[PDB]
Amino acid sequence: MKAPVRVAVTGAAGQIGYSLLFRIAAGEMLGKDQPVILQLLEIPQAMKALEGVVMELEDCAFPLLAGLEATDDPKVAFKDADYALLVGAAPRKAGMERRDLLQVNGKIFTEQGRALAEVAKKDVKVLVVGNPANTNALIAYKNAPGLNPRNFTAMTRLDHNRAKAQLAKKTGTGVDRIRRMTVWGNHSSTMFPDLFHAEVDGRPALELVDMEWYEKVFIPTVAQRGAAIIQARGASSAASAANAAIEHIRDWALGTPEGDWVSMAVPSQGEYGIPEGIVYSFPVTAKDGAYRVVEGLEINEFARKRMEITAQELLDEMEQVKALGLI
Amino acid sequence: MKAPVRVAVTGAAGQIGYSLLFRIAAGEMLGKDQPVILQLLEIPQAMKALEGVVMELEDCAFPLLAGLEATDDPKVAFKDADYALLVGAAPRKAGMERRDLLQVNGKIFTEQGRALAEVAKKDVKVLVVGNPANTNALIAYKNAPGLNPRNFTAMTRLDHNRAKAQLAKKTGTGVDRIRRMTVWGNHSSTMFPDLFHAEVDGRPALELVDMEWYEKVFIPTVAQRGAAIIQARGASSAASAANAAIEHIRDWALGTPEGDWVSMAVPSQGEYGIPEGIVYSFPVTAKDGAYRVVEGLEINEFARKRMEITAQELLDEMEQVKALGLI
């Protein structure tokens, strides 16, 4: 009954894409009643592999996959796109410094931001997964004239889900009974998982766990989780990252649970005193395709300090891209 | 919410498992209101990697995942299991002939067959994906007296889904409009994709495509599809295989659509003249945990010949394993 929506995904032949595309086609991201047209983008040298991915999707015989297209041209992939997941970023080259990484991404996201502004739906919803997510999203929307900056977001949902999982394990309760978890700031190590407003069965989390555990165990464990996965499996956490990306888009489009909220890195408008422009993770609720930052939360010194630290890291990264003339 | 069911999966840390576990935990296999308890099995050397997979699953914060346990002991993994997906088989390393491979698979499935008979639910539904699927299932059920042999099946759903995709592509119609596809016999190359009863938008398939294309293009392409994916992506088609595995269990536990059927390799009871005992793919309809071969179908010589050839291959494999003292 519903008309198909176009979903563009970059870095389509990579690991996250491999764990992501099949669930999207299965209807797990936008609803089992929502047909989807996948428009996949890859760099020229990965087009053969992308064709392999296309064949696997066809071999799933998905009743909701209304269309499937592979290309190496952003203007074709983003054509009339309703949603865009920017997964592909700059590969970690050898003998390459951090700054050098920034310039490569700068070229990638400036071009993609331009393509989007040129051929996608004016209200296209964008999620940046490629690292560094927050700054890449910044570069993208700053280079997307005519489009709504607020429709450019970055992912922190994996960190958010990881936090919920740790709290559940600690308190011995189902993760499904955990709500109001918050991750503030950058996608990086300065990211701040907030338990001050989180609840376990309706009870404040800090009534179940002490501050020492929170500061000395919870925070560092959430921040190091990605590395733990790598040390154990010998590969990055692509499957859980893909799940988080799906949930990020899903909750944004279909809505958040009543009385709960999720984490999304979005362009700041000064909420909580956070500098404008930088893509910062905030607690947010969503309804009918629009999100809103949850304001009014009490912020104590402990949280304040960590929120400012991550904000400053984001300001620093923003300074660097400005210097490089990317924005 | 239904009471939780226990789903055992072997080779849990491998490629198929990585594309399989998350969708199962998401409710894609048994329904969005059916809680699941994943009991994962791996070989001792892969237990660390499996712990990594366990962490990624936790990090998805799945509301339906009521339990999660990793082990290297089949008696622990299959304990009270309602479903068992046997994915892990013998790894083919250099210096191993067919006989060598059959020996190790023989020990693997005799042990798992015995473990299932000893600790799993009496009505445990078993799907064998590890190759050679059909023969491994035979070894498994023959070594599981006490358990319904019809409960031991082998997968042909990927071949089935691939066949539907090719027909859809050729006729230029949505794959959702393709029904009554059938794959008979062995999981291997002698596998026979039947187009004589298939319909496209209600019309007989052979009315839209000719026999020349069927024999010279359709059959070979479906048979070589797995190799085509490897050549394009550089890796096996684990995601589409996991999808097929999910649909195989899903359509069995829940049910097949009205007026349609699917393909499943199951212990023959003499249907269509197929020797008794060998796990052979047949067209089947299913309802709430029980399937039935679609008998009474008109079989032409073109199909008979191929059904006969693939059946002979299975007989020979059965004789090979019998001579090795595995059954």
UniProtKB/Swiss-Prot annotation, chains A, B:
GO biological process, alphabetically ordered: malate metabolic process; tricarboxylic acid cycle
Q: Where does NAD(+) bind?
A: 11-17, 105, 112, 129-131
In terms of Pfam families, this protein maps to: Ldh_1_C, Ldh_1_N
Key words, A-Z: NAD, Oxidoreductase, Tricarboxylic acid cycle
Catalyzes what? (S)-malate + NAD(+) = oxaloacetate + NADH + H(+)
Q: Extract the InterPro entries matched here.
A: L-lactate/malate_DH, Lactate/malate_DH_C, Lactate/malate_DH_N, Lactate_DH/Glyco_Ohase_4_C, Malate_DH_AS, Malate_DH_type2, NAD(P)-bd_dom_sf
Active-site positions on this chain: 187 (proton acceptor)
- Classify the source by domain of life: Bacteria
The UniProt GO MF terms for this protein read: L-malate dehydrogenase (NAD+) activity
Which parts of the sequence bind substrate? 92, 98, 131, 162
Top-level EC class as recorded in UniProt? oxidoreductase
| Gene3D superfamilies per UniProt | Lactate dehydrogenase/glycoside hydrolase, family 4, C-terminal, NAD(P)-binding Rossmann-like Domain
Q: What is its EC number?
A: 1.1.1.37
Instruction: Please name the PANTHER family in this protein's record.
Output: MALATE DEHYDROGENASE
Summary of the function given for this chain in its UniProt record = Catalyzes the reversible oxidation of malate to oxaloacetate.
Quote the subunit structure annotation.
Homodimer.
Regarding protein family, the annotation reads: Belongs to the LDH/MDH superfamily. MDH type 2 family.
Q: Protein name, please?
A: Malate dehydrogenase
